[PDB]
């Protein structure tokens, strides 16, 4: 067919290698996400992890999505490609925001499309815990929390409620502005403490457009350069993934569903059929991994132990950076043990630290 030869076509008309990144394999998984490199890392680590105990590696078709108004046509092209142009088709993973945005098309196509769990569950308790322990003073302030969508506002006041914090807007001169997005905190002319939590990757335009003395609450992208820095087990990082960065929330939020789906595929190859020439009937009823007999909740140290990345979780941090004109490292919350290290810089060259009362003690309700 034409769809197997030309591939996915995005409208000039764009070539397939601009937005699809493929590791080869016998079974083909499809990931449709904003950050494809974390998905390529998760499928690469379950390939070298060998949780399946089978000879065939897991394949990926990682569709890069930059605007959300073109993902429907590439979903139509990917259900045509994974119905026609492959031998075995497990499913199409869509991230949680494009799953909740386009649920009518996914319900109308009736094909095996499952959501990746959302990364804001891995990010917004880290935001509320870095705001809970922050050295502030004895001043209460007026908070104005600006988000892009209202769902981030509901989950942020939920995460502030489990950290025992009340955030109320009094009429006072001391102002705190928390902005949730990549374009809300761009040259803010208001005066006060500015917290800026980005959603996507941080560019040089975002660090250019921020005000002076503004706080940047983001996670660390981890650059991949060699395969010996990931684990003590000798593995092989694939050559496409060298020189590129992963976000750790996307890694963990995809990797829980990957650990559940390959544990289901362990059960399916244990009951059926490991060599894929001898093995037959991989995928008969595949919706049962969403049911709770094979769907489990894993801790993050278990995810790094199962997928052979235990030396990676030292660099899995959530930081808070202040822009002084330089991004000075102020806070650091590790993902694997939730320990929160604040950084103070003795300046004025003193010999003592008067410890300020923290932000969670002032705003305690």
């Amino acid at each position: 067919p034409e769809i197997c030869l030309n591939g996915l076509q995005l409208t000039v008309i764009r070539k397939q290698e601009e937005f699809v990144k493929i590791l080869e394999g016998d079974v083909v998984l499809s990931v449709l996400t904003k950050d494809p490199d974390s998905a390529l890392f998760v499928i690469n680590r379950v390939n070298q992890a060998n949780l399946i105990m089978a000879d065939f590696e897991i394949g990926i078709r990682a569709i890069s999505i930059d605007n959300a108004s073109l993902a429907e046509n590439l979903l139509i092209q990917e259900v045509q490609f994974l119905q026609q142009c492959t031998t075995y088709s497990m499913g199409i993973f869509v991230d949680w925001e494009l799953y909740k945005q386009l649920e009518s098309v996914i319900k109308d196509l009736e094909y095996n499309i499952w959501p990746i769990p959302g990364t804001r569950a891995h990010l917004f308790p880290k935001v509320a815990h870095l705001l809970h322990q922050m050295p502030w003073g004895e001043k209460i302030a007026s908070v104005e929390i600006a988000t892009e969508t209202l769902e981030m506002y509901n989950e942020f006041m939920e995460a502030a409620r489990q950290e025992h914090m009340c955030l109320m807007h009094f009429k006072s001169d001391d102002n705190v502005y928390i902005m949730f997005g990549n374009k809300l905190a761009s040259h803010f002319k208001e005066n006060g403490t500015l917290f800026s939590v980005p959603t996507d990757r941080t560019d040089d335009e975002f660090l250019a457009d921020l005000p002076n003395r503004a706080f940047v609450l983001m996670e660390n992208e981890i650059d991949l350069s060699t395969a010996v820095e990931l684990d003590a087990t000798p593995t092989a990082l694939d050559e496409i993934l060298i020189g590129k960065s992963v976000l750790p929330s996307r890694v963990l939020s995809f990797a829980g569903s990957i650990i559940d789906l390959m544990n289901w595929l362990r059960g399916s190859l244990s009951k059926h059929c490991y060599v894929l020439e001898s093995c037959f009937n991989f995928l008969n009823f595949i919706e049962d991994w969403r049911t709770s007999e094979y769907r489990q909740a894993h801790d993050t140290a278990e995810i790094l132990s199962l997928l052979l990345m235990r030396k990676l979780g030292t660099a899995m941090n959530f930081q808070m950076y202040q822009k002084k004109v330089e991004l000075r490292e102020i806070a650091s919350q590790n993902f694997v043990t939730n320990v929160t290290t604040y950084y103070h810089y003795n300046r004025d060259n003193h010999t003592s630290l008067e410890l300020k009362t923290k932000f969670g003690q002032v705003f305690n309700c």
Binding site: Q133, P135, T337, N338, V339, T340, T341, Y342, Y343, H344, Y345, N346, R347, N349, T351, S352, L353, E354, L355, K356, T357
Partner: protein, 1000 residues
Amino acid sequence: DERMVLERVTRDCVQRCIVEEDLFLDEFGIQCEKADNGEKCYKTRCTKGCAQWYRALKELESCQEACLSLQFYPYDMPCIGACEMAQRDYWHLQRLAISHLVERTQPQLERAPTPLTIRWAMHFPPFNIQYQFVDAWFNLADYDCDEYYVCEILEALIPYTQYRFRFELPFGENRDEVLYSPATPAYQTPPEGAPISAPVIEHLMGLDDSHLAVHWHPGRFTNGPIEGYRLRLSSSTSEQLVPAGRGSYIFSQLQAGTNYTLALSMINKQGEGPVAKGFVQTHSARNEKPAKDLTESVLLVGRRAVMWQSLEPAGENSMIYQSQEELADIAWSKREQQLWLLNVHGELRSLKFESGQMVSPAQQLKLDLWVPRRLSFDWLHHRLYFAMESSFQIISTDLLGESAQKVGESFDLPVEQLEVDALNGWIFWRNEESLWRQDLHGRMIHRLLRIRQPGWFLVQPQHFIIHLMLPQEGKFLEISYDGGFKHPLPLPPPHWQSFALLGRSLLLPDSGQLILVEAASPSASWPLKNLPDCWAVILLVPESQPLTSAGGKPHSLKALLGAQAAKISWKEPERNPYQSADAARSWSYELEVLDVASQSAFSIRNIRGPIFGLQRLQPDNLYQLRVRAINVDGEPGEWTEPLAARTWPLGPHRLRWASRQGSVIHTNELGEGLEVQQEQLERLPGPMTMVNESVGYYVTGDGLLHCINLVHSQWGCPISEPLQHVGSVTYDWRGGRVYWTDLARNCVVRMDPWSGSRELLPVFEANFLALDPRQGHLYYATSSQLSRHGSTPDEAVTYYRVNGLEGSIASFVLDTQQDQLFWLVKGSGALRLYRAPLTSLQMIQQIQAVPDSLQLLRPLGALLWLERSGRRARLVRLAAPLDVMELPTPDQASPASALQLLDPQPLPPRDEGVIPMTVLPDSVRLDDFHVRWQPSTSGGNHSVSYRLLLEFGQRLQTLDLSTPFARLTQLPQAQLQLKISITPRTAWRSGDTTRVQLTT
């Protein structure tokens, strides 16, 4: 004059029985007059003690056994007190009689060619031999002696150890009664057997990827003359026999990035000793770049030209400076980008260059001060070092000229090369016959080699390695920073006169080319045209002139914590044996303070000094503390081991100090409040025992007990004189009684603070006291034992016993709330702390202390004593016993003899429910018969006992009765007239005495 000492002690004894005729309240309530002379009176019972003090010493009898009376049972206390005071005064006179003869006569050591014998020339008109290590006196267990004091030692001594011997002469049973001889001139024991002490690793570090340095000194017990050492190096084997006097080794030809383990031992004539171990890495290897990938640069210096070369395969060539004269020495700088020049006659020409050309021209620098001959550059302290000709002398100037400072003594031989190691603080130079060393102030002068005519040398500052060529021998050779390590290396044969290292390569100049050999055919060759002679190649890498050292870890972290504050002090990373005193000691520090319960940390970067304070911390919270060192370029070092430290609970905690001069200040838990109080005590006071908020009692260091009233000094003290021979003092808040150990009387004296009525209590040989107020148990400690005294004699519980040669009990404290009982045992070179319940003996820690200084700190749950120097107080918490906090004494009261954490609540008043009510005198009646009285009962229901006195005619009978009925026997006939006294008592007090006269 024995008969004069005996009669003067007996006369002073009967005078003390006369003057104390109405001072002590009796348990039966006797109250004799001044001329009664009956059996029950104080004079006859005390004169019975003074008539039997020398009989008890001749027949080896105790004072309790010499003063046994059937009438007063079980303890006739004025008799026992007069006997013990007369014996203590007699042994005080017998130590003042023979003080100079003991302290003048020195014993002499004798061994005949057979145990070792003391000969003491002592003619007298118990004894202890004490031994001391020669590098505290320890008692000798086994000896065989005679009447001529020829004492032979049969104990197994440690071999090849120098010993001094002393005689301890305990004259009395008091421990202040001892007399010591002068010590013997010292004796070395003969050697036998294997060495029993391991060597001590001073430094064990890695020099570069292939060398590894260890430094050691010998152990304390070598058990012979040291002949050799054995080093076994193993990866996580090479064995080398190093001789007797050497204390360093560098292990060559090792692999990079590898954990190594090294074992030291001592070899005498008899055998090998024990094994000391240490873990060390070599280094990470430098990535050796190929011949194509070389972005670095050199500088080729001739007699009349200086030519810059880039190390590309198509390398750029440029003259920097061409001289009309002959250059003798030149300097270079990486960060200032400055090059200095020198000639045959002295003309210093500095020249700044950047990227291989002129930026600044050759400007002449006259040296404001000796013609200059050699030149080197200090890049840290920014000085120029010159070796001049007048004899030859190294001086140092500044970059502008002037500020001339002469370094070291003058010397005869010329300097052919001068190199300054700024980072390790050294100056290296070579003569015609030798290679040498100095620091930058010229203090430590060492000669590294004596080799006939060496060539060029290059000093590696991180790696502590000096590579040296010998061009006449064709030999390339490798020297440490102390000259002990001489490793020959193979040279690429052509003679070469200069070299450089880029990693492990060798950059050798010929007249036509510079070759880079890792034979004569190189890995890379750069062509030369304009330079016929080349005597120097200087590589333009910042590793040639570094700012920062390799590694750096702090040590000995310690922290004193309050409630809401802390004082954290660490030390600076230590200096290598290849680092001088003028080295780079500039570090910043980073301290990470981890909240354990909250799982949060806060990290203070850019701590300049080795002390940092913290304040507004959380009270009663555990914190873990680790620190690391940040150097000049800003890369971090290694963290320490974490110190778990807990803050005090919330509350104003006053610590009361007392200086040895007698000044009382009040501080807080760190020693920062410093409120000087208006009271002034006597010399060397002990801890203060308060009766109420104003009046307190304290014991000075000479044994005197004083009373001081703080708010008005006229009244409040019922005793007028200070009272002699008092060891400790305590108070009962419930009964209202002051208890002190009478050291002369060998007893415990219980006194009313309002009236001064003293009472002799039968607690014998006690040194320290405590009273448990809930039931009245009197806890006491002898130097041998720790016990308990109660109302019934079934409550005597002994908790610990010391043999006496092991040591003695230093203090004890009583924890009545948690039913715990701690004590300190001062021992033979150790200070041990224990724990037992009041109703399982647990050793808390073994670590000396002031006696009666162990205080219980009920907010922190810790225990605090004061050291014998008086400038340091030690805290051991019960939750973390392995970490001992050292609290510094504040400088107002800086030699301290007392420390006391004050009670924040006031003292409770006198409980009226422990006072026995008096028996009514009309109710004492007659029914072998019985005597009945109205039963005395206190305010609260407590067990009230009674004491009886049956004075009929001249015979008297005493009974101790818990019952209110008196089973009276042993009357001789009918029609007697009884004088009957009843004295009720609780466990806290005694009641008044009710005296009736009834006839049978």
